Design a protein around this ligand. Sequence first.
Ligand SMILES: Cc1cc2nc3c(=O)[nH]c(=O)nc-3n(C[C@H](O)[C@H](O)[C@H](O)COP(=O)(O)O)c2cc1C
Ligand code: SF4
Ligand code: SF4
Ligand code: SF4
Ligand code: SF4
Ligand code: SF4
Ligand code: FES
Ligand code: FES
Lengths: 156, 439, 139, 227, 120, 226
Amino acid sequence: AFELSAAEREAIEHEMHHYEDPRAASIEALKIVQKQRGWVPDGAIHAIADVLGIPASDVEGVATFYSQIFRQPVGRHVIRYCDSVVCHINGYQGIQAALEKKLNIKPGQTTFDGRFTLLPTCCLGNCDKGPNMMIDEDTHAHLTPEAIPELLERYK
Amino acid sequence: IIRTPETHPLTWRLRDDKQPVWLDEYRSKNGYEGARKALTGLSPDEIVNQVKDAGLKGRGGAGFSTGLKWSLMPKDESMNIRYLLCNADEMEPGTYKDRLLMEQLPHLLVEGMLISAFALKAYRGYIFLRGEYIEAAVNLRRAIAEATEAGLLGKNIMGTGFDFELFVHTGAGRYICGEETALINSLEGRRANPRSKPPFPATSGAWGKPTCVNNVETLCNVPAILANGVEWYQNISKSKDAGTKLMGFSGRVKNPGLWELPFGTTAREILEDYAGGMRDGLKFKAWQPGGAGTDFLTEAHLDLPMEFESIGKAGSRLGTALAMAVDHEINMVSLVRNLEEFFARESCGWCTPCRDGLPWSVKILRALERGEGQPGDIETLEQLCRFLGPGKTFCAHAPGAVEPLQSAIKYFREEFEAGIKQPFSNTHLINGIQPNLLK
Amino acid sequence: EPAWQTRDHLDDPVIGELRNRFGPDAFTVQATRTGVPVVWIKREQLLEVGDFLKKLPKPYVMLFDLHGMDERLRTHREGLPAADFSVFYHLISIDRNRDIMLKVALAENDLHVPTFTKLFPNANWYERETWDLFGITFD
Amino acid sequence: ATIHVDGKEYEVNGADNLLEACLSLGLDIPYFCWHPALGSVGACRQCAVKQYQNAEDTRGRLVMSCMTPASDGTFISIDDEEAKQFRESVVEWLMTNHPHDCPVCEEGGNCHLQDMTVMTGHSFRRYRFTKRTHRNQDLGPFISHEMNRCIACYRCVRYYKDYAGGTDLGVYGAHDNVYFGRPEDGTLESEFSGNLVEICPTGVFTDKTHSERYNRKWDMQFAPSIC
Amino acid sequence: VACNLCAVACPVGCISLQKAETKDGRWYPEFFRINFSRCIFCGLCEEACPTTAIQLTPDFEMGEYKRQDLVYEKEDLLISGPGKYPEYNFYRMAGMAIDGKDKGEAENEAKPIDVKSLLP
Amino acid sequence: PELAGIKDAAPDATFRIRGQKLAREPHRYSGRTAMRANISVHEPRQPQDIDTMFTFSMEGNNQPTAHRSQVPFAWAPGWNSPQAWNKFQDEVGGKLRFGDPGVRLFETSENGLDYFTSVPARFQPQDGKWRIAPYYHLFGSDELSQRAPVFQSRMPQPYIKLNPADAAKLGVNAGTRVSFSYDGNTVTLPVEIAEGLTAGQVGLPMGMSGIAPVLAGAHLEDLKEA
Ligand SMILES: Cc1cc2nc3c(=O)[nH]c(=O)nc-3n(C[C@H](O)[C@H](O)[C@H](O)COP(=O)(O)O)c2cc1C
Ligand code: SF4
Ligand code: SF4
Ligand code: SF4
Ligand code: SF4
Ligand code: SF4
Ligand code: FES
Ligand code: FES
């Protein structure tokens, strides 16, 4: 059971105002639902399909195509550590090891309380200040393994 | 390091406190004068001809000339619905130039999109921005709001009757969205499978309409051409590639950053005179000129100008001209394994060789990393490199994927040959069945 | 060139001898993997071709085989003469250590060939079997 | 139009692409993603031939024949060694993740993928790693789903959506985890969903009604009848 | 697995069988009959079997009083053990899910990755 | 004489391809000495087909280049899939080689009919009467298709379709059972609400259990809640 809120529907329709085809607002509609509810549940695909007038298979294919549209329940905070080449040169592996030691999880899954979830991510476009890590809205550069506990303690 | 407007057209108005320049400060530092000249004194065909004669090539990595791409637009007046897209995705690893360009000078990008939309007769413009550039999105939206507040965007721009609306479309985090036809597909809210050419996006792009996709940096050099003149732009450097370029070395160097240099600048000048060379106690081993999709080059190629044709004959691509340096401490098998893991997880899955041959190379490189390599693995990698080239795959993601692999095999074959420790074994013995002992 | 490669055997001296005796348009050379020159001979020239091969300096002394073939359902007959049926004659020259196949095309209604029993006495049972299993008359 | 295939002249229709023109002449080019009714999209990269600029050209270039128009005076080669090796490599790349399923698969003896694996002459496996797997969906009483056998040729989605007008079948996922099916388990809504069993070149979509009393194609007695 | 490869590989056509499926989803012969009055003991069915189910064994004493009794049904062919090939199991290699063997549990198979998973 | 074209639909039983009939089963048809061995070890006589040009055996022709239009199945060597129809066509995606089977009975007339002046009046919803709107189903309207056991799961439960205004007039909701009598046969069906239906009409699924397709356009009496 999934009911869209009034604010979500208003934002989705305002995004449909920006394009000449309502299908073009599918990515932003999924992002709006994800921003409001943490992720995109199974009924959200059908709700966006009925709002946009496009089939639910198209919305599901878009949601499963893109990496930042979550189709599984995540924690209240998302760690996104850059595993790309420049951060590998600058030692992202120590950062990943420190994150695995602190969270006591493997990458891809969530903690037992749903407080963090850990994700290897693409290049963040901050390679001159590598290694980099993206918490929910904040980018962090010049990472050291010792700074992981003092950086992760400010996100509850 | 001084930055005059005559030799640093893209970075001379940058602020020393790393703060963005808004509309009043931009107009103070010679802002929207090229847009005013273009909209009040030039026909759109004249602006396209000036961009073509200025030698402005693309900055996304392909290096195609902007004037030739703009000249592919149809001459029919019946199709007045036209789109201009700005590839602000910057999803290539090793690239951080568009982030600097939009996080601190958004009005330069807005003015360039305005000029290019007037030149292309484009009625709408979209900035396809990645979802990780939150600050760049905020700055671009504020700059757009200030531009329509001052009448620089919307209906009847500068009293000329030209209507242009600019939107910011934030992406959902996929590398293949940077491909121009795949960018068009993701703009339409579809899966970012790239399209085949012909037909080109100029003939029928976004929603079947004439559409031109250009990089952030190209639309940043456009106002400099339209303001300071064409003959000023051709006389920036004595090279076949006219104009400046955002170049810079990154990765375990003394000064990892980004600077604006004319074309023809040698790679050793960027590494030594700008990046300060390698860090303490690090021996330089290799470098990539244009990010993750470019071939590795050795220290012998460091005395080469950073032009498209110069790096092309060396066996690599100039790309985004943002070079990355690899020292002696890094194992090349591990680095190419990380690169191929990126390129195999960022496949779009449309076409067979990339989708089913990049993971095979990934697993081979994983085996070479752990010392579990078997004979025929390097031959398999070379076959994959020659069978994932241009034309064999549907788009250019897989040739750019296999370029570092073949370059590392060509220059550092002893590191790949050191991972082969086990004999080849594909079958296990089945009791009662004698195997066919092939020789 | 492996042993199974499709050869035309135009370098065989028997092909040159047949060309010098009967002319270049009297027969058609078929490229096969049989290892022998396969030569489609017109029906009216079959007896003189067999006599000419029997009177060679190193002659084809043995009729190795003689049998028919129903070619009505054969779809890949490119480069072959039009034939509802055909009769092949495999001859061996022991002195040359060579062998040649001669093929005679036959229409569906006109299923009769001149007999080979005068040149080779062992053609009798082969022609009896070809008549028995294909209906090809031997005059 | 006039084409030259392997040095032999052929007269074809210029409006067709190269793959359908060559298949109309009896030439055998392997192909997966192209269908005569669905058009060409150039996904599977199986139909590769070598095209030359003129008669006096030796290098050439690999092109997809399904996406190459059969223009007048077009010089190509199917039996070129490079094109044969690339087509064999495409079949091999498809074969790296394919399940060991032919005896217990309803498409055996009727399988386009089997026919093109044999046609390319690829019979030796040099891939020693793991193969990806997928869960299956319930598509209703008619179509049985087996996602492991997929080669990502996109024929099902193109037919069911662009041709049949259906809405509930689609492609999900990414790089090598592309999934073809419904977003959830349920009956395929289209009245023409049964043609997926002939559109799909593999054993992903199979006739479940036939799969109850299954027999192989060589064991059937057929007749030309009218529905 | 009732794949009918032995039946078609038989040049005499003396093997008849029908595929049936259990509830877990494994294939098996509903019936299996060999007409041993026709069989030439050529071993082509054993050669064509991809599961090593059908085997030709060292036993020559099969004389019968009635020719109808030379038609051996499945109850006369199925033995208690693996015969000449002791360890091969086709369903440990096949990709279909059966009882005791789910998806990704066969040889050289990875676990199925859902398209909804958070990893790229 | 109006059916004189059906002679040319297929050739007669004397039709041969180079003297041989057309095969019904493929070349590798298996088990010919064992499918009936449980009944008797003696092989039965092959069934003779005197009616048609086909034979109940492999002893026949199914070549893709055979001069015929009736093709029992597509198979070419190296093409065992449904893609062998490419081998059976002159050009792929076109017609069958040597023509498609079937012949049109009638040609287009030179002169047409006249305009039908019998223009009907508007639909008048009369109380007591109920116009039966036909609702056809692909799985359930054809009789023999209904007899197929696999269609029983695919076919839906029979729902009598009602307008929201008419359902409010009867007071019946969505899912409740109402009973109606036609030809002295009181049968009951559960109600599904059809908004697109026009008031004064009641929707009936045709071909189903008890609902004959002759009810299209037929009036209805005694629509009451059961
Ligand atoms: C896999 C792939 C990824 C790409 N990513 C980007 C990108 O992130 N940003 C970009 O400007 N161009 C990218 N490109 C290049 C575009 O296809 C296109 O050439 C460019 O965006 C616009 O051309 P321009 O340089 O003339 O402006 C990518 C190309 C490929 C094949
Ligand atoms: S090479 Fe093929 S599968 Fe890979 S990203 Fe491009 S179109 Fe997609
Ligand atoms: S789809 Fe084809 S290749 Fe795959 S298991 Fe089935 S018969 Fe074999
Ligand atoms: S399910 Fe079948 S038709 Fe669809 S992409 Fe896979 S192989 Fe092709
Ligand atoms: S051994 Fe007997 S049953 Fe087996 S293939 Fe030969 S004749 Fe047939
Ligand atoms: S005995 Fe072997 S070949 Fe015959 S049906 Fe069973 S598994 Fe197939
Ligand atoms: S490589 Fe990590 S930010 Fe670019
Ligand atoms: S058939 Fe041409 S690429 Fe698929």
